[PDB]
C-alpha cells in the first residue's frame, strides 16, 4: 500500500555530486519525519539524515555533516538527499525510510559507487545456517541500557528492509506470530519458533534511546 520510489543514484567520480529523490505515496508525507540511511557493501546499516515534520529541521550524521543536505517537498511528497563532495566511503545502498526513530517502511535502495561517542550494538551470530521448521535465535546487544528503545528489521537479499518488531517486543502489523521479540536493558533476543522457506534473510537491530539511531551489522540466515 505504502510506496517509497527512489531514484537519482549511481556512478560518480570522487568529488561529484547527487541528488537522490525519494517519492512517498499511501501515507500523509507531511506529518511523518523521513530518513536516509545508507548500507556499505559488506557492511551494517548507518544513519545518514532525517527531516522533521513541519519544522524545516534537519539532523545528519557525523561523517557526512556538512556535505549531504536533505530536504522535502510535501507538494510533491517527495524527499531529497543532495550529496556533495562525495567521497569513497559514501559508496552505498541508500534507502529512504519513513519516521525518524522506528523505520515502518523503507525504499527498495538505490545504489551509489563512487571510485576512479553513540551506542554500539552488536548482534550473534553473524551467519547462521538451519533448515526449514527449526527455532532460531539472535541476540541484540547494546553497549549501554537503552530501555525497550529495540527494533527488529529483516532484509531479504537486494530488497528492502521489512520492520519486524518495534520497542523490544511488540510485533508490527502484518509481521507472522512465528516472530518473536523479548528483552530489555542491554540484552535482546530475537526468536523465530518455526522457520519457513521465505524466512531466509540477514536481520538487523536499531535503537533509538540515543539519537543518532546506530544499527547491528545483521544476522545473516542461510540454507543448509
Known amino acids: 500500500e505504502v510506496q517509497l520510489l527512489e531514484s537519482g543514484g549511481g556512478l560518480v567520480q570522487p568529488g561529484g555530486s547527487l541528488r537522490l529523490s525519494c517519492a512517498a505515496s499511501?501515507?500523509?508525507?507531511?506529518?511523518?519525519?523521513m530518513s536516509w540511511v545508507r548500507q556499505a557493501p559488506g557492511k551494517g546499516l548507518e544513519w545518514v539524515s532525517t527531516i522533521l515534520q513541519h519544522g524545516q529541521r534537519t539532523l545528519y550524521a557525523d561523517s557526512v555533516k556538512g556535505r549531504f543536505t536533505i530536504s522535502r517537498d510535501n507538494s510533491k511528497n517527495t524527499l531529497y538527499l543532495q550529496m556533495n563532495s562525495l567521497r569513497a566511503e559514501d559508496t552505498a545502498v541508500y534507502y529512504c525510510?519513513?519516521?525518524?526513530?522506528?523505520?515502518?517502511?523503507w525504499g527498495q535502495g538505490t545504489l551509489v559507487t563512487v571510485s576512479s561517542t553513540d551506542i554500539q550494538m552488536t548482534q550473534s551470530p553473524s551467519s547462521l545456517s538451519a533448515s526449514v521448521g527449526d527455532r532460531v535465535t539472535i541476540t541484540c546487544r547494546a553497549s549501554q541500557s537503552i530501555s525497550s528503545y529495540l527494533n527488529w528489521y529483516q532484509q531479504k537479499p537486494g530488497k528492502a528492509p521489512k520492520l519486524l518488531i518495534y520497542?523490544?517486543?511488540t510485533l508490527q502489523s502484518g509481521v507472522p506470530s512465528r516472530f518473536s521479540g523479548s528483552g530489555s536493558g542491554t540484552d535482546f533476543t530475537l526468536t523465530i519458533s518455526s522457520l519457513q522457506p521465505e524466512d531466509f534473510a540477514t536481520y538487523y537491530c536499531?535503537?533509538?534511546?540515543?539519537?543518532?539511531?546506530?544499527f547491528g551489522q545483521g544476522t545473516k540466515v542461510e540454507i543448509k
Open positions: 499511501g501515507f500523509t508525507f507531511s506529518s511523518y519525519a
Open positions: 520497542t523490544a517486543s
Open positions: 536499531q535503537q533509538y534511546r540515543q539519537r543518532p539511531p546506530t
Open positions: 525510510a519513513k519516521n525518524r526513530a522506528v523505520f515502518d517502511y
